[PDB]
Design a protein around this nucleic acid. Structure first.
Ligand SMILES: [Zn+2]
Ligand SMILES: [Zn+2]
Ligand SMILES: [Zn+2]
Ligand SMILES: [Zn+2]
Length: 140
DNA sequence: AGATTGCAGCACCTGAGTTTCGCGTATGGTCACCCACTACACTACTCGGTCAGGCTCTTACCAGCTTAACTACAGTTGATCGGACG
């Protein structure tokens, strides 16, 4: 895989000056300046569904760090991008919309009908230690 | 009534119709081995983004002046706007 990407598919080289760069990111920045079109805003947001464009690389660095920070779900630690990403993923845990089933983390048999009732099993066969966070998190 | 002779009865070697058999030749059947394909979960090296380090370029200068434009003061006229008409 490395041989193909270093002897035949020269993807890390400039299309114009024939320098090369240690990551595609720096090649992109290089093309955006040293071989740039007459465009006023040489930088464009690299992320999903974002259409914004910028004059100086520092403003793009700021925009990525502000509006596309890479987060982990507070409950399930799965990664997501930006405020919308977190708010979209938080629906999955929501007990008002997602009228989910109720089970033990270990015991195969459980089949509760309400959240308060599920805490009886975790309060007796387990205890207040090693209950799952989605059950515990009365955060709203 | 004897010398010549046939009948036919005895016994033992022999022959086929009939049978049981052995094998060929070949066929369906047991079952043991090991192969091919598939696949859930995994191993591990690379690529990639991000960050620092610190060497690097390039700015534009102080008050004044002296080369260059605006940036406020200013006046009659627009035609959206309110709110009420059709
Ligand atoms: Zn180049
Ligand atoms: Zn963006
Ligand atoms: Zn979550
Ligand atoms: Zn249990």
């Amino acid at each position: 895989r490395a041989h193909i990407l270093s002897v035949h598919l020269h993807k890390l080289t400039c299309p114009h000056c024939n320098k090369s760069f240690q990551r595609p990111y720096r090649l992109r920045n290089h093309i955006s300046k040293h071989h740039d079109p007459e465009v006023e805003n040489p930088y464009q947001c690299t992320f999903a569904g974002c259409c914004k464009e910028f004059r100086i690389w520092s403003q793009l660095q700021s925009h990525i760090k502000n509006d596309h920070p890479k987060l982990k779900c507070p409950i399930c630690s799965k990664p997501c991008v930006g405020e919308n990403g977190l708010q979209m993923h938080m629906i999955i845990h929501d007990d008002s919309l997602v009228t989910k089933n109720w089970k033990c983390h270990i015991c195969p048999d459980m089949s509760f009908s309400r959240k308060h009732d599920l805490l009886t099993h975790y309060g007796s066969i387990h205890t207040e230690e090693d209950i799952p966070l989605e059950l515990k998190y009365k955060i709203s």
